[PDB]
Known about the structure:
This is Endoglucanase. About 0% of the residues lie in helices and about 50% in strands. It is mostly beta strands.
Amino acid sequence: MASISVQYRAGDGSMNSNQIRPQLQIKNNGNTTVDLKDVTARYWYKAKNKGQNFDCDYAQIGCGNVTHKFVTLHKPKQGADTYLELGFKNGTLAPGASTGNIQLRLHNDDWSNYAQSGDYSFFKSNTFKTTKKITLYDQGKLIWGTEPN
């Protein structure tokens, strides 16, 4: 019954640099509140069996209220062999409200370059745009977007 979506843009920088820079917002489009602790988001990309590392640079809700982990896929899919899963410690969204910006950076253990063109969830855009390629979940159940096949 919760209805949420994600707005996204890649942070400024080369798609071939040593950092992925997902910038996200989650919006409540429904007529219920949303408890962010129950919400997770997944950004799907290719890490090529390099260890991944996370930074939260800024979030309107406070970086200390965002959680993360990296999950390697059983086997690679087109556009993805891993996802970053974001979660939340606390917070709510009223109908129509947004988290506002969540600005992240990911790097490889060895600080080597990514080539992000192929990544399922990657897109360059001057503006935040709603995307179905970053998926959202309510207690682990898919409620926004489409997972890689």
